[PDB]
């Protein structure tokens, strides 16, 4: 290839790593944001869950 193209290929990948790393941890936060509010009845429902099973 050409070095002025490879400079534009290699720098485009470096910006894409700065995009996907940022956008993964946006989903890693919102899945823990769903986790702190799901245990308001479900953990109590878990006490209703195991004693109906066991």
């Amino acid at each position: 290839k050409g070095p002025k193209e490879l400079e534009s290929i290699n720098a485009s990948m470096k910006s894409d790593i700065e995009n996907v790393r940022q956008e993964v941890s946006s989903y890693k936060e919102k899945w823990l944001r769903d986790a702190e509010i799901f245990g308001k009845i479900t953990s109590i429902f878990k006490e209703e869950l195991l004693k109906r099973d066991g």
Binding site: G2, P3, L6, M13, I17, V20, E23, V24, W31, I37
Partner: protein
């Protein structure tokens, strides 16, 4: 442009090509190796782990604000219509 400008030796500028002709693959093997696999496999696993936590988060957002907690609300007015 230095072959035609006056007062220069020819063999002294023919050696500026051998400098230039080897500085053109010392910058084509520096972006042809760091772009080969060290930045390929950084985008291999990271695009799989983006898809998983976009798919699996699409289901827990579907349970909370969705057709389980909406179907808990639609059944109770089906009771008092009969009662």
């Amino acid at each position: 442009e230095q072959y035609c400008a006056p007062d220069t030796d020819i063999r002294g500028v023919d050696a500026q090509i051998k400098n230039y002709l080897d500085q053109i693959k010392m910058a084509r093997a520096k972006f042809g190796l760091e772009n080969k696999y060290s930045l390929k496999e950084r985008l291999s696993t990271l695009t799989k782990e983006l898809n998983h936590w976009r798919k699996e988060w699409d289901d827990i957002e579907m349970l909370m604000f969705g057709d389980d907690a909406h179907s808990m609300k639609k059944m109770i007015q089906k009771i008092d219509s009969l009662k």
